[PDB]
Design a protein around this ligand. Structure first.
Ligand SMILES: Nc1ncnc2c1ncn2[C@@H]1O[C@H](COP(=O)(O)OP(=O)(O)NP(=O)(O)O)[C@@H](O)[C@H]1O
Ligand SMILES: [Mg+2]
Ligand SMILES: [Mg+2]
Lengths: 121, 251, 345, 217, 121, 216, 107
RNA sequence: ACGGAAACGCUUUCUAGCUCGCUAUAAUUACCCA
């Protein structure tokens, strides 16, 4: 679960819980997860965060249902996105949206994940 | 031609001077230093300072002392030479009083061609808004920038402002757009803007050239460090420092 | 103006298939003349639902009937007297060599792969497919691009480095991008009368047979001239795309000595111009760095259909005789063995 | 004096082009690289930014003597026809490259067009292990034409800069026919023709008799 | 019937209900159904999903008529696909489409099926 | 007597318009330059200040003898129509531009438009290094219309300059068509067309039947 | 309830030089659209002016159509106006005066 | 017989200028099942 006071801190401590490249000493402690397997997932929630400011929540429930498909699919392809969305409980944060406010909270959570992914390594 | 075309007004007051005059000397000894001679020499000291030495402190500067005496200094002038005037005045007054007798000023910026009562009243409101910070404070330009002087002259005006000026003159890539985007992230500031600032400065760390990259890294590890400090007396200082650096380089 | 344009000419010795991803199923054609008619099956079902027989059609689609000439949607129309065949798609003439059985088996082909087509409907060769044929000739015949193009001890001998050939924006550096400087155009969209749908014929070593496969891709007929335009904006790119004549000969020389030997020479064509292996059915060794994928290519196959020992089964087909290209009997072409000649304009 | 002229053309595609779109809500097994298209008719557009930043850079390798290394280092024949950000007199730049919308939709509907954009499947063969990586990228179809507006300003700074800038604009257009408008380019995807070059004045007084002759050079 | 708040969950519990290799105890819990025969099902609707955005539904619905027969014929060949189209009520949901917002929900439901099948296995 | 004239027109877009709002620090993958939008309905909007300022600078290229160094240095033909901070008599000059508020949210929703703005992804390519830098800028979609209106007042200080002013107003709208009106127009945005030009007298007594034929 | 965070929007704006062509930004705080504000306007029918009340009602009312047709605010030549009165009723408070001959002249 | 009477925080002002959604990438591999 994520609330209005702690969604940035979970995205902080979830990048730190994501395991890095222990071996392959060429700029070590790099992540197995790559940037472009993460900007694709943000590319959905960014275009929901910009539609939630205008359109009502009872018109966005076709895209909000498909975030649950895309996170599942991108985790099924590569193990690093699986290690992301199981460390950061994204599939249990997608279960709880229900209105505009928690939707925008999740869409800011997905951005805080990327900001702290960029900030570390 | 660099510098915003504003004039500042400062109003000062030595905090709790009547308390420092009547009681005054009653703490050391056992009431043995509470004579009339100590208070007479104290009156001559304070009168000597506020009627002789303020003209020494206002020597080179572009200002006008509209009143000085007792414990008031009301002075109009150019804003660089008002902020420099009051930093100099207090850093000499706390040498003059061994660090006793706090004074607490209010500086306000005003554009050109504005009436003088509309100017002086808004300065005096900043002065009384700095009386009640705790007691000893300077109130730069507005009701919110209210700093203790020991938390202002060391931290804002000498530490942070010179670090900001030192970074932003030894380069060419980063400009005033970067400073404006830092002022916005400093002023709004939820927990989300800590992550957005951590993303912004890391984007711009890998956008600067490899000649000036440790120069930018030692600036972003210095700005992100006080932004996320969790004491609130380090983030508010940076906003006033960046306001002063933008006011210095205005065309 | 370093836009040095060229003019490649491509002569198909072997049948060439490219693309489209999709494929017609077993019940999506009509063979009643000596042509194959591939309709628009949406318009087929639309015009057949007037016939009040769509449930018998749905019975025909799951009908597990033997005698495959009665399964292929011809007998559905001959039995139930649908004879208009005014539907969408197109027709192609036969190879004549598809059904190996002279006992009837006519139109008993099963699953054809479509050819790449524009939205007008006409086939063409895409330039991105011809550039991948150029790029392997350039990679194998350049010895600096063959050493470390490999694992670096990461996973299951996994993948190409993709960074031996210096590619990128590369922040702080100038802009090389050698294959941005090799600009290959799509061809002129040629006609439907060049397509024959050869089948597939896998010809093995150490067991001299030619067992055929149920994979009958819609390839181009041999001896079809197809033109291409290539512009080279870097002089470094201009050198390689001029020296393709030497490099294609060198690639085919190093590939015959590696792979076409251990196969009998009667099934192997001669070049007659500069050789190139355009896609879909030329084998893996024409799409890869063949002298660097000897213990790395076969590792991917621990399945029912593994590569035999090493240097996998040859990929012949059966298209009819022209000029002669074949050199043997029984019409065994090589499925992608084309040729080119280049000249600067 | 003030004048404002207009260049009409037709961007006839030749092996049609990709100009990449935006949606992340695409699919699993369908188009992952959309073309830019008009949000109401769902017809492909050639946006004027992709025309402008191809002409601005292709002429930069011709008319800049000193290599630019940055925009607004252009050689004042490009800085005034496109606009700097940093020259005090060349902030605006007297050319308006309007967007281009697919004109001949009925001519394409006369041909056997299923849909106005085709989808092209383009896997990446791993040059070791021979494995693939399919992309399904969308491109506007081959014989599409696009109406190409181009509006030019003539103020009281054009003493003799008018006819000099038209051995520059048509120079850039005949350099667009040697390059590729974005997409892949190195994989086809870009070749255009410019048809019916027809200059006219939409505002003011200017004599385009002497201009409508070097369009047909 | 499948609607917006439940079709991803219907797909999730569909994929868990496909039977597995009860024998063949070499990496068990492996489906009879494979990735290839399921992407052959998604490739039927992947064209109609992006022809639905441009074209009207009334100039499109003969393909939606034929696509029922396509799912029938892809079901009538393998028992691991005839099992799939009955666990997930695909044939029952093809009859109830009748507009654009259910065509882009069925073609999205097939994407959900592929996503959870890739996620499990 | 004192009169007023109202100018109904539909601002129909082509090559959809961008009028920028906040340059405030956006979210991480969000829209970078958003269009100006209404706070209540969250539709696009054209403010009257853009329509005034762009038409002011366009008519400053036609109706000025000497090149104006500043808007106070504009002509007497334009100061009476757009106001002047320095003339004693041409301060608050005779035109009230109003905003425009996306009249056909029902015509656009009859067509398959999902949102009344599109977001075009876009980039710049460096000259050396050819390294890409994307932006996402928002723009009100192509087939919008906007309810445009002016309130031209007649205060009897002109008495014959009335029909001289519509040869400036109609000329300014004709220039706004040919120029772009708003945002990145040299990359082909804006491109407004003016439809249904109709002058009505909403206060006072003035006849406009000889004026609509000037508006054609 | 219509969904908004503040009752005042911040409109960004600028000023472009005619020669240098360099902008000069601004943030102008406007009240938002369809905010509805209270309004009352006491007219005192005193003793002397009894014959001239109705010719001071065709002037109060005529001064409201003008505010609907002029801007009523600051910087209103650039939008920022267009203020329309509604439910314009005239009641009587502290008096004995019949306003059923006026409320039809208003609506 | 109200430190009160009369008084628009008002006029002017384009969120603007510049900027390629771009870079690399054969729809290909394996040959078999009953
Ligand atoms: N040298 C002096 N000796 C004695 N009294 C003095 C001297 N200089 C000023 N004063 C008087 O001391 C009083 C202090 O006034 P004021 O500053 O208002 O009070 P305060 O003690 O400072 N409390 P605060 O106003 O909160 O700082 C005034 O009446 C001054 O006239
Ligand atoms: Mg005091
Ligand atoms: Mg005092």
């Amino acid at each position: 679960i994520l609330t209005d006071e702690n969604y940035v801190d979970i995205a902080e401590k979830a990048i730190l819980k994501l395991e890095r490249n222990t071996r392959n000493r060429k700029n070590p402690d790099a992540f197995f997860l790559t940037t472009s397997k993460l900007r694709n997932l943000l590319s959905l929630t960014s275009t929901l965060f910009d539609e939630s400011k205008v359109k009502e929540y009872d018109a966005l429930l076709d895209r909000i249902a498909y975030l649950r498909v895309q996170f599942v699919y991108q985790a099924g392809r590569e193990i690093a996105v699986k290690d992301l969305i199981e460390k950061a409980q994204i599939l249990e944060a997608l279960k709880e949206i229900k209105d505009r406010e928690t939707l925008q909270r999740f869409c800011r959570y997905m951005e805080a994940l990327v900001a702290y992914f960029k900030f570390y390594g | 031609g660099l510098g915003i075309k504003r004039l500042a007004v400062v109003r000062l007051d030595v905090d709790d001077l009547g308390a420092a005059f009547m009681a005054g000397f009653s703490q050391q000894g056992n009431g043995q230093y509470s004579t009339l001679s100590r208070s007479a020499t104290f009156s001559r000291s304070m009168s000597l300072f506020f009627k002789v030495y303020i003209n020494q402190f206002a020597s080179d500067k572009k200002l006008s002392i509209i009143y000085a005496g007792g414990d008031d200094v009301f002075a109009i002038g150019s804003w660089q030479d008002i902020i420099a005037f009051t930093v100099e005045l207090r850093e000499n007054f706390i040498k003059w009083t061994n660090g006793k007798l706090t004074l607490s000023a209010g500086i306000g910026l005003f554009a050109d061609k504005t009436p003088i009562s509309l100017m002086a009243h808004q300065t005096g409101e900043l002065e009384e808004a700095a009386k009640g910070n705790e007691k000893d404070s300077i109130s730069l330009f507005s009701s919110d920038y209210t700093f203790k002087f020991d938390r202002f002259i060391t931290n804002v005006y000498d530490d942070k402002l010179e670090q900001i000026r030192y970074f932003f003159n030894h380069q060419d890539e980063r400009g005033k757009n970067f400073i404006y985007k830092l002022i916005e992230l400093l002023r709004n500031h939820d927990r989300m803007n800590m992550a957005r600032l951590a993303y912004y400065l890391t984007r711009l760390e890998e956008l600067t050239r490899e000649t000036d990259r440790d120069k930018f890294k030692t600036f972003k590890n210095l700005f992100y460090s006080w932004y996320t400090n969790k004491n609130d007396k380090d983030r508010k200082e940076a906003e006033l420092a960046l306001l002063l650096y933008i006011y210095e380089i205005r065309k | 103006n370093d836009y040095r344009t060229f003019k490649l000419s491509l002569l198909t010795l072997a049948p060439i298939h490219i693309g489209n991803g999709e494929k017609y199923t077993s019940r999506e054609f009509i063979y009643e003349n000596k042509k194959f008619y591939f309709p628009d099956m949406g318009k087929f079902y639309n015009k057949m639902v007037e016939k009040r027989l769509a449930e018998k059609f749905e019975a025909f689609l799951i009908q597990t009937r033997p005698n495959a000439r009665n399964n292929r949607l011809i007998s559905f129309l001959n039995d139930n007297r649908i004879a208009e065949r005014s539907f969408g798609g197109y027709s192609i003439s036969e190879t004549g060599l598809e059904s190996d059985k002279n006992p009837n088996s006519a139109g008993a082909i099963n699953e054809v792969n479509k050819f790449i087509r524009d939205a007008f409907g006409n086939p063409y060769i895409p330039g991105s497919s011809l550039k991948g044929a150029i790029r392997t000739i350039l990679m194998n015949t350049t010895p600096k691009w063959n050493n470390e193009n490999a694992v670096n001890d990461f996973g299951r001998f996994p993948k190409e480095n993709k960074n031996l050939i210096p590619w990128g924006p590369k922040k702080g550096k100038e802009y090389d991008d050698l294959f941005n400087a090799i600009r290959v155009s799509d061809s002129k969209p040629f006609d439907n009368k060049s397509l024959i749908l050869v089948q597939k014929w896998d010809y093995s070593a150490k067991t001299n047979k030619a067992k055929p496969l149920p994979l009958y891709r819609e390839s181009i007929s041999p001896l079809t001239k197809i033109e291409f335009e290539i512009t080279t904006t870097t002089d470094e790119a201009g050198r390689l795309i001029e020296e393709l004549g030497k490099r294609a000969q060198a690639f085919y020389k190093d590939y015959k000595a590696f792979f076409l030997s251990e196969f009998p020479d009667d099934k192997i064509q001669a070049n007659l111009q500069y050789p190139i292996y355009l896609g879909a059915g030329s084998g893996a060794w024409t799409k890869t760095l063949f002298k660097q994928a000897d213990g790395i290519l076969q590792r991917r196959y621990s399945r029912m259909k593994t590569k035999m020992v090493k240097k996998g089964v040859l990929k012949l087909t059966k298209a009819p005789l022209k000029t002669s290209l074949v050199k043997n009997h029984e019409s065994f072409y090589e499925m992608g063995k084309a040729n080119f000649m280049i000249k600067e304009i | 004096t003030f004048a404002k002229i207009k260049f009409s053309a037709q961007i006839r595609l030749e092996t049609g082009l990709h100009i990449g779109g935006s949606d992340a809500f695409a699919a699993i097994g369908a188009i992952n690289s959309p073309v830019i298209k008009d949000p109401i008719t769902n017809l492909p557009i050639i946006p004027g930014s992709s025309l402008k930043g191809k002409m601005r850079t292709l002429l930069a390798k011709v008319y800049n003597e000193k290599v630019a290394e940055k925009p607004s280092d252009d050689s004042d024949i490009l800085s005034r026809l496109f606009g700097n950000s940093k020259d005090k007199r060349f902030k605006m730049g007297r050319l308006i490259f309007r967007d281009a919308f697919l004109s001949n939709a009925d001519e394409l509907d006369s041909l056997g067009v299923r849909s106005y954009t085709e989808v092209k499947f383009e896997n990446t063969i791993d040059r070791i292990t021979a494995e693939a990586n399919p992309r399904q990228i969308e491109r506007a179809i081959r014989n599409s034409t696009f109406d190409f507006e181009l509006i030019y300003e003539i103020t009281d700074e054009n003493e003799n800069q008018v006819e000099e800038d038209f051995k520059v604009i048509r120079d850039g257009l005949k350099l667009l026919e040697l390059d590729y408008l974005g997409g892949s380019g190195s994989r086809g995807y870009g070749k255009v023709a410019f048809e019916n070059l027809k200059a006219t004045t939409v505002f003011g007084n200017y004599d385009v008799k002497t201009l409508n002759e070097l369009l047909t050079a």
